């Protein structure tokens, strides 16, 4: 464990296997250990930006959190993982992921998403693949911990200055209890429902319950945890999910029907929850993403009527083309994650009436349009959202009037 | 909890998660190598139920009351460890999230929460009335939501429009801002007592609160503060 | 027991038949709303004839 | 001083007080006064003129009937058309309107209906079982 | 007509002199962005030199 | 296999069926006494799998391609078979019977068949647009074709009858005549290349087939095949 | 009178567009200005950060 | 009332035009075709029953070729019988005879 482990690819035991020479090192973790404690913790109030939008506003994450994204097949979660290792590139944070049981060519390709990102700058990429032994796959979970656990107690040095934040993706938590559960059986333990072992919710809480938030007494590091679960036919009620579930303080649920009807973050935000909420974001994301939440459940309520607004009322009609609008705005390209300022800026354009008139094809394209107007007509915008996003009354007067200037000459210049 | 108890005090045990209690049951019985019963549940959880939960009495003594929380899987309230903690409930008390969307932190549903102690002779007699009365008029409300939202309270008839304002008036009085928890919404502490409630709902119930709008009753005392709120205002 | 798939499938069936049939109500009440509309407004004529 | 009621089957035109009035009846024009006898009227295709305290409206009609009374006149058109507007004839946002009216209304309605009935009896056969 | 033009009038002049200040903060700031890249670039070649020497 | 791969030379590889392997990995280890697994299947089901799958890379020296068949029971791909193969796959083509059953023998679904490949960065800008574009039609066709078999399409249509047409000629186009189908058939087989078929769907996805019918779009190679077809039968 | 002041009001407004777009104009150079300076100032303190980090 | 209670929509048969006869082959594939045809746009049947001139004709005439497979026990058909009842139900010739009358 230390600053010797960024940028490799290693094996659950440490050993490299990108090719790229010995690790150097100087202090060795264990693999298992008890978890900080009741004293030891402290309140979650520092936010991790995904970089997705819907995330970030409706299902907030923060440093020492433990929250599980579970989804079914191909739904994005592992690109939904990436993407929060790749927002992490200046926020002080170090990634590690863990990719247990997958193919040596998916660890493969995610290593040179990753790379060609300049992402493993500060990420650590253990690796216990699916040919490799049940026992690799059952201890890789536990080797990356650890290795978070050394970033969260003492730190290391990235970009010259001292973090002690990480964030760790178990990008199959599934997989790793299959391992055990055939590590299990081959050891003829006795079997329980869908044959796991009788330690198989202790199996994954021990990995989950390390993911901390040490008060200033400890450190004041954390370790945030992203598990990844893969259902079966969505059967959110199975051994492991409903295990992982509870284990967890929030849920992030990706949908086969939401990926297949083109949102490209299947994220389905009526039964994601996030049970720390407010507390893991920014006052600024705080101030806006009130309303984008009420509106969105005002559209679920809904959306029975979407094909139908036409033949609705005005108020009716409004909600669903306003809902209709927000959810074509959480749409987001893979490989692109948006900073917080453009989060804030983009969600207090749609939930002021400013996309009204833009219709609901061109939603995406008119963010990435404003995104670009305010990467090159507006940085001093962007800069003064993110100044004072941690303002108590987020929208001042000056950052409020900047934004709307901003909003307004945009739209005046553009057309849709 | 018990040496409390044995001291003749009214304990308030709270349970976490009793579902958690079932699971480390089943667990701990897979563990020891024991055959699986129903779900893959213990063979022993009835028994590992009484042996806790019979332990919660009103004793000569003392009295140790108990709040648990308890996860359904699946929404399956048949599913045996509901099923096991059904057996030894004497009162529920359902939160809705759609209650909770409407900003209502004291989401209890009224039409799904019961208790055995909803008697006439136990609880008082316009206790069993008032309390009757309310889930008749919350249950014809939750009748005329649908209609309501689909056509408007212009097609509901007398007896109904009023129906459903109480409704809407008693609904939105059921919160409660919790000021002993943190400060959210502050005010001073009430601890609405049981005979208060009754008298409130009774006050509402008989008339003696059209006139109040429906949007005073929100984190309001014993519809005393809430007549003190409308003359403040505008009266 | 047919299957748990199975009965799932039928759920997902008959709660996206409640869906349909719930838009259904909605545009038919607006439609009934608009036809009381126009007999309105076609009633003055009809008097004066 | 006489209520100038003109009323379409489909929709009421005009019911505001009206100082002087004309009418394309079948046998001469003929100018109704707020004290002009009682009077039945068939209108031919024609160009109706409200010049109630000078406002000289041309206000073209296809046939209808009129009924004059005392103290009002009623108007009972076939299909009338504003003769002046803004543009030529009939205006163009008149018939932008229309056009979205009951062509791509009618069209929406019809296909969205069709759909769903599809749409629940395709989900529903596939039930079998309750 | 005139106080129609001179609104239009009004309105596309202040148009044009937010397009031509958005042009220029761009130009300017491509400019900015490509110094840095090659001081940057310099820095890390200067920097796997003298860690080549210091080898 | 692994011979050829290491000779330098991209050798292909075609596992005729994925759920057998299971099936008789799962044989193997019930006659072995070993434990069972989730619903009786073997507890190295995964391992297995990996084993077997592992070896099939793209290498520095060579590099082994594969199709493997895989027959899903009804429409469960939630058994353990296909499940414990998904994470392994670059690719799946969904066969469906119906498509079969309309004389498309090669059967292929475009929706839901997915590809990592398929990306403009890869497969270039004008593959990823066609396909992308292609799937966008028949997907609209999908509702079209439920709306229109009650509301006819001479009825009513908002470009409605072009995208249906279109949609029609490419899912006939989607057929092509196997080498090995001649003994069902009769007709020759045809091979076309990645960048005549992507070429072929582009010409007619916008004009240039609205005037042929969907008659010779059946069963033929390339957009060239289908014009030889139609001025030969205009002679 | 109306066509007087309508003359007026035109000439008014449109040398007020003028000054307001002079003035919109300067503060747009003055910003490009500074943000040219602080990605300088950034990047050279990147390449100070990187020079010691590389002895 | 489908005595033989073959379900041909699950049904396979995985030689197929191989372990038939040429006659078979040449009169059977329109049959197949128009079955599939029948099973696919058959919900639109029960309640549903205006639709158009082309779904009414194709639900029809799969009702017609349906009831052409029902066949009594112990009364095997030869193959000539076959391809020669199916030659007049798949060139149009039973098209004016009504449904309760086909096996007959
Ligand atoms: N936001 C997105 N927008 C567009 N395409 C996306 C997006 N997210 C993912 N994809 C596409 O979907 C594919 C599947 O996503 P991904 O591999 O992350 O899913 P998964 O749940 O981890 O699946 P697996 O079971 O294969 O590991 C990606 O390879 C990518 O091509
Ligand atoms: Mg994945």
């Not at chain 1, 929060?84 to 193919?103: E, P």
């Not at chain 1, 990235?158 to 178990?170: E, H, P, T």
């Not at chain 2, 008839?157 to 009085?173: G, H, M, N, P, W």
Request: charged content about 25%; glycine content about 6%; proline content about 5%.
């Amino acid at each position: 464990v230390g600053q010797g482990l960024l940028g490799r690819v290693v094996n659950p035991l440490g050993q490299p296997i990108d090719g790229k020479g010995p690790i150097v090192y100087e202090k060795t973790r264990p693999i298992e250990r008890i978890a900080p404690g009741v004293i030891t913790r402290k309140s979650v109030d520092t936010p991790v930006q995904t970089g997705i939008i819907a995330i970030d506003a409706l299902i907030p994450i923060g440093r020492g959190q433990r929250e599980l994204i579970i989804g079914d097949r191909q739904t994005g979660k592992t690109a939904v993982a990436i993407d929060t290792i790749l927002n992490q590139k200046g926020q002080g944070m170090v990634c590690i992921y863990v990719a247990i049981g997958q193919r040596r060519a998916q660890v493969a390709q995610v290593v040179g998403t990753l790379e060609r990102f300049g992402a493993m700058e500060y990420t650590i990429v253990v690796s216990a693949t699916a040919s490799e032994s049940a026992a690799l796959q059952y201890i890789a979970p536990y080797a990356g911990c650890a290795m978070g656990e050394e970033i969260m107690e003492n730190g290391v040095m990235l970009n010259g200055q001292l973090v002690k934040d990480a964030l760790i993706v178990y990008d199959d938590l599934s997989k790793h209890a299959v391992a055990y559960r055939q590590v299990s059986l081959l050891l003829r333990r006795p079997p329980g429902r869908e044959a796991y072992p009788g330690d198989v919710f202790y199996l994954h809480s021990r990995l989950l319950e390390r993911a901390a938030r040490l008060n200033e007494e400890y450190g004041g590091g954390s370790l945030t945890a992203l598990p990844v679960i893969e259902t079966q036919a969505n059967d959110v009620s199975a051994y492991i999910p409903t295990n992982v579930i509870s284990i967890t303080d929030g849920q992030i649920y990706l949908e086969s029907d939401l990926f297949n009807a083109g949102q490209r973050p299947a994220l389905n935000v009526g039964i994601s929850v996030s049970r720390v909420g407010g507390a893991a974001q920014t006052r600024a994301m705080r101030a806006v993403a009130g309303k984008l939440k009420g509106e969105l459940a005002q559209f679920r309520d809904l959306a029975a009527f979407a094909q139908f607004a036409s033949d609705l009322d005005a108020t009716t009609k409004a909600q669903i083309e306003r809902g209709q609008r927000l959810q074509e705005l959480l749409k987001q390209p893979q490989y692109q994650p948006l900073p917080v300022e453009d989060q804030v800026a983009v969600l207090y354009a749609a939930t002021n009436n400013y996309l009204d008139d833009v219709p609901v094809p061109l939603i995406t394209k008119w963010r990435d349009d404003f995104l670009a107007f305010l990467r090159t007509a507006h940085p001093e915008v962007r800069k003064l959202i993110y100044d004072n996003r941690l303002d108590r009354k987020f929208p001042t007067p000056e950052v409020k009037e900047a934004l709307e200037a901003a909003i307004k000459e945009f739209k005046a210049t553009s057309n849709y | 909890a018990e040496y409390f108890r044995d001291e003749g005090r009214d304990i308030l045990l709270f349970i976490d998660n009793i579902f958690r209690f079932v699971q480390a049951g089943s667990e701990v019985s897979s563990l020891l190598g024991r055959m699986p019963s129903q779900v893959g549940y213990q063979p022993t959880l009835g028994t590992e139920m009484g042996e806790l939960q019979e332990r919660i009495t009103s004793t000569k003594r003392g009295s140790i009351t108990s709040m648990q929380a308890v996860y359904v899987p699946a929404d399956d309230y048949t599913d045996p460890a509901p099923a096991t903690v059904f057996s030894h409930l004497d009162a529920t008390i359902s939160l809705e999230r759609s209650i909770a969307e409407r900003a209502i932190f004291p989401a209890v549903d009224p039409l799904a929460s019961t208790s055995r102690i909803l008697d006439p002779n136990i609880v008082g007699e316009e206790h069993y009335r008032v309390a009757q009365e309310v889930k008749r008029v919350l249950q014809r409300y939750k009748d005329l939501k649908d209609i309501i939202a689909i056509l408007g309270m212009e097609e509901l008839s007398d007896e109904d429009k009023l129906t459903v304002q109480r409704a809407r008036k008693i609904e939105l009085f059921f919160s409660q801002p919790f000021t002993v928890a943190q400060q959210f919404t502050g005010r001073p502490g009430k601890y609405v007592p049981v005979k208060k409630t009754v008298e409130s709902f009774a006050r509402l119930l008989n008339g003696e609160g059209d006139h109040i709008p429906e949007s005073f009753f929100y984190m309001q005392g014993d519809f005393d503060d809430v007549l003190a709120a409308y003359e403040a205002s505008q009266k | 027991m047919p299957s748990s798939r199975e009965i799932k499938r039928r759920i997902r069936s008959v709660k996206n038949v409640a869906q349909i049939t719930r838009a259904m109500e909605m545009v038919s009440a607006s439609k009934m709303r608009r036809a009381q509309r126009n007999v309105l407004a076609t009633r003055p004529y009809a008097d004066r004839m | 001083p006489i209520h100038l009621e003109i009323v379409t089957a489909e929709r009421v035109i005009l019911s505001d007080d009206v100082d002087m009035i004309s009418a394309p009846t079948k046998d001469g024009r003929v100018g109704i006064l707020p004290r002009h006898a009682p009077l039945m009227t068939i209108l031919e295709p024609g160009e109706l003129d409200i010049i109630k305290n000078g406002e000289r409206t041309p206000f073209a009609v296809s046939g209808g009937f009129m009924e004059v009374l005392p103290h009002r006149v009623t108007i009972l058109a076939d299909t009338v058309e504003r003769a002046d507007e803004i543009d030529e004839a009939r205006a163009e946002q008149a018939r932008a309107e229309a056009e979205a009216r009951r062509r791509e209304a009618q069209s929406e309605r019809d296909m969205a209906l069709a759909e769903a009935k599809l749409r629940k009896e395709m989900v529903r056969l596939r039930v079998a079982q309750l | 007509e005139q106080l129609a033009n001179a609104r239009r009038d009004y309105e596309a002049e202040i148009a044009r002199a937010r397009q031509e200040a958005a042009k220029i903060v761009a130009q300017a700031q491509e400019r900015a962005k490509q110094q840095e890249a090659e001081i940057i670039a310099q820095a890390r070649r200067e920097a796997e030199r003298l860690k080549e020497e210091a080898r």
